[PDB]
Structures are given as C-alpha cells and as structure tokens.
Amino acid sequence: SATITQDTPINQIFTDTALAEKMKTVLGKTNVTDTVSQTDLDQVTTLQADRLGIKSIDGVEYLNNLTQINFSNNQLTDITPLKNLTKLVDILMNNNQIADITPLANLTNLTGLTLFNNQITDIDPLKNLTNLNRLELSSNTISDISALSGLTSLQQLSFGNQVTDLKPLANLTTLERLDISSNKVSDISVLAKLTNLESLIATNNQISDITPLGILTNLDELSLNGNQLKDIGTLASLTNLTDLDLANNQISNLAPLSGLTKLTELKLGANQISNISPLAGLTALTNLELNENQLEDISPISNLKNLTYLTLYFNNISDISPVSSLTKLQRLFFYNNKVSDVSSLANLTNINWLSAGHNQISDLTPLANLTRITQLGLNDQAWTNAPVNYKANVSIPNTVKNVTGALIAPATISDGGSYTEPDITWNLPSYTNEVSYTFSQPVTIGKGTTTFSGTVTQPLKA
C-alpha cells in the first residue's frame, strides 16, 4: 500500500487542478483545500475521470483499492502513478499523449486495456498481462507486436500503425474481433490460425491474397476497404457474412459472392466491376455501394427489394429503370452516368436523397411528386440532340423542362443565337457542324435544393 503520512489537503495530493476538483466530489468534500485521510482514499474502487483536461494523475497512487478507471479524453503523458495499483482490472485511457506504458507492466489483473490514440511505439511492457481479453492500441506508432504473443486470453484486439509482421498473433486462438486497419500489412497468412474470428477489420493495408481467410467460417463481419484485392474466390467459403466491405480494390469477378445470402450490407465502390449478375440472389441487402466501377447494365439490381441505400455514381449507366421497383429506397446516388430518362423514379415515393448531377437529364417533371426529398442534385447535365439540317436560319425547340412543366430559358446560346419561347434560333452565315446552348436554374423539390444546369449540343447536317 501507498499511504499519505497524515491527513492532507486534496489539492496537495492531486496536484492536477482538474483531478483535484474531481477528487473533492468523489471524496464528498466541500473544498479542494479540505483534508482527507488514507482511510477516505482507500474507499475509492472506481473512478470515471474522462474528459476533464487532466494533465497529471499524481495522487492516484494513494487510491490503493482502484479496480476500474476511465481517464480517456485527457492530456496524460506520464502514468507512473498506476505502477503499484495491482487491483486494476479495467483501464480506459484512449485519447491522451501517452508514450511510455512501462508503469503497466505489473498490472497482471488487467482484463481490459484501452490505449488507442496515444503516442505508443514500445509495447514490450504488456507482455506479462496474460489475463487481458480486450486490448485496443490503434492510432499509435507500433511496428513490433511480438509482446502480444503470450496474451492467449485475448478476444478483442487492435493495433497500429506501422506493423508489417503479424506472426506474433499465431497463438491467440481465443481472438474473436480483430482490427489491423492502417498498418503495412500484406501477409495475412497467420489469420488462418484464428478460427474463432467473427469480425475482421483490415482497411487501408496492402493485402492482395485472402486465401488465409478460407477456414474462418465464423466471420460475420469483414472489411478489406482499401487494399489490393482482385481474386476474392475465398469469400465463397464465408457464408455467415452479413456485413462485407471490399471498396477501393481491383475486383472484377463477383461470382464468389453469389451464395452469401445473409449479406445485408455490401460495399464494392471503386473497383473494376462491369457485371453484377452474381449479386441477384442477395435479397437481404439493405445497403449496396457500386460507385466508381464500369457498370452499364444494372438489371440484376431489380431483385434487391430490401434496398434502402444505393450508390451507382461514376459508372456508364444509361438505363436507371432497374431501380424502379425498389420502393424502400431512401437514398439513391447515380451522378456521373448517362441517364436521360428519370420517368421510372416517379415510383420511389420514399426517396429522401436523390443525386443525379452529370447525367443527360432534360425533364424534371417525373420528379414532381417526390415531396419527401430533402437532398437533391441535378447540376451539370450534358447531352447531344438528334441532328437537324444546317440552314442559314435554323431553329430548334427548347426541351429543358423544370419540375413545374415550364420550359427553362437558356442561360447562354452559341453563335449569337436567341430565344423566343419555345424556340432557339441561329442566323449562321456559313455551315457549322454544331451549335449549342446552356441552362442553369435553381430548383427545390420537397425540401431538397439544387441547380438544374446543363450543356446541350445540337449537331447540324450539311
């Protein structure tokens, strides 16, 4: 035991102003200058001192009976006062500036230790904390995890951000939930040994080979967002997956996903996908991200009646009509495609967010009854009219229609042209292969506001 040598002012025990204020309330005193006894201090067994701007825990060594502490969201560096508090079983100290965790080395009763978002490199002092079942070390600067190799009760683990070598995990077969995000990992072969894994988060790494996952059939949650994946054949073994993120990879072949019918969320944004036929039987999906691929035909999507959230932006899609039966849709994004007809979207009476900039849309009238919209995008349309004949005097109908059914007057017209509703007219002295015009019109549908703008090209035949 540590003991104060006599009754002492709280503020002479706890030299931190903010910690002293807290301990005054904990210890049932009126003023931080009031004295307390060692007996009073020995009554404190838990302490929730998160989010108080504490810079020093000097004084806590005299709280001999502590079992659980929260000092998260503070400004701690030195944690030497924990050194002899061997009754500690749970420590929360995420979001500090701790570098030296040597004072933890003898706290062998610890079962939970949260240290993410600190300045830790060296984790050798954790090596004898063999009763840990939860250890979080992400958002640090750890490169070497050999000190984890003897923590064979671990169930929940994370670390970062410089690890390449995962071999120290080999014996931690009690692991259920692992986050190795934002390291330097390419080789995940050791993970095949962790057959109790239910959740694996491994975003922002250099992983290309996922064959090690093959026997990890208890996986329900897997994130490989931001890696170098292409062959995902191994995922066909993981039929318990409900939540899968493979965004930001090089995947083209989705056939291995076709049997993962427990999937409710699937992210496949920023890949090399042109064929989503393999997704047609994934009817439990509520969330599907297919942005930044090479899609044209999205007809397999019409089967996915439970979708509430769908991204399709940055593809080469002309026909949006496969979404038309997905009436639970609340948020739909398909900006940067080639959609010219949104008549099918009239069906999406539950739609709230509708994002359709950089398409070929000319007529908002099908959207007019979508009054639950709160977010809308219709900027920067562009399309080419069917050719008309070059003549000295040549007129075409304006075809740009607001949600009201009213024609939107051109903003600009090439080659000195003019507008008299409904017709755009050019006097052209000699043959030109095309003329053009722009429009730009703010519009609100429901509560969703955008600028409906675009560039229309009119080819002229010789």
Question: Residues interacting with other proteins, by CB under 8 A?
Answer: 51, 72-73, 92, 94-95, 114, 116, 134-136, 138, 156-158, 177-179, 201, 203, 223, 287, 308-309, 311, 313, 330-331, 333, 335, 353, 355, 357, 375-377, 450
Question: Considering beta carbons, is residue 353 or 419 the nearer one to Ca ion?
Answer: 353
134, interface contact from Ca ion, other proteins, none, CB < 5-8 Å by kind: other proteins
Instruction: Please spell the DSSP secondary structure of 309-346, one letter per residue.
Output: EEE--SS-----GGGTT-TT--EEE--SS-----GGGG
Single-letter amino acid code for the residue at 136: E
Question: Considering beta carbons, is residue 247 or 445 the nearer one to Ca ion?
Answer: 445
Token digits for 410?
């051109």
- Interacting residues with Ca ion between 375 and 414 (CB under 5 A): 376-377
Question: Can you tell me the distance from the alpha carbon of 80 to that of 98, in angstroms, rounded to the nearest whole number?
Answer: 11
Helix, strand, coil distribution of the chain in percent, nearest 5: 15, 25, 60
Measured in Å, how far apart are the chain's first and last C-alpha atoms? 99
Assign 353 to helix, strand or coil: strand
224, interface contact from Ca ion, other proteins, none, CB < 5-8 Å by kind: none
Question: Considering beta carbons, is residue 313 or 439 the nearer one to other proteins?
Answer: 313
383, interface contact from Ca ion, other proteins, none, CB < 5-8 Å by kind: none
Sign of the four-CA dihedral 95, 96, 100, 103: negative
Q: How far is the CB of 68 from Ca ion (least distance, A)?
A: 18
Token digits for 415?
């080659």
Question: Can you tell me the distance from the alpha carbon of 65 to that of 446, in angstroms, rounded to the nearest whole number?
Answer: 60
95, interface contact from other proteins, Ca ion, none, CB < 5-8 Å by kind: other proteins
Assign 452 to helix, strand or coil: strand
Question: Considering beta carbons, is residue 327 or 427 the nearer one to other proteins?
Answer: 327
14, interface contact from other proteins, Ca ion, none, CB < 5-8 Å by kind: none
For residue 81, give Cα distances in angstroms to 57, 66, 280, 390, 457. Answer: 7, 12, 59, 87, 74
Question: Considering beta carbons, is residue 331 or 390 the nearer one to other proteins?
Answer: 331
Question: Can you tell me the distance from the alpha carbon of 102 to that of 79, in angstroms, rounded to the nearest whole number?
Answer: 9
At 229, phi and psi to the nearest 5?
-75, 145
Number of neighbours of residue 262 by Cβ within 10 angstroms:
15
118, interface contact from Ca ion, other proteins, none, CB < 5-8 Å by kind: none
Q: Which residue spans within 38-89 are E strands per DSSP?
A: 46-48, 68-70
- Interacting residues with Ca ion between 55 and 84 (CB under 5 A): none
Q: How far is the CB of 423 from other proteins (least distance, A)?
A: 33
Question: Considering beta carbons, is residue 76 or 376 the nearer one to Ca ion?
Answer: 376
Q: How far is the CB of 424 from other proteins (least distance, A)?
A: 29
Q: Supply the DSSP symbol for 248.
A: S
Number of neighbours of residue 20 by Cβ within 10 angstroms:
19
Give the interface size with Ca ion as a residue count (CB under 5 A).
Answer: 3
Q: How far is the CB of 59 from other proteins (least distance, A)?
A: 24
Q: How far is the CB of 116 from other proteins (least distance, A)?
A: 7
Q: How far is the CB of 90 from other proteins (least distance, A)?
A: 12
Report strand pairing: 448-461 vs 381-384. Answer: parallel
Question: Considering beta carbons, is residue 10 or 279 the nearer one to other proteins?
Answer: 279
Question: Considering beta carbons, is residue 352 or 450 the nearer one to Ca ion?
Answer: 450
Candidates 450, 452, 454, 456; binder of Ca ion (CB under 5 A) is: 450
Residues that bind Ca ion (CB under 5 A): 376-377, 450
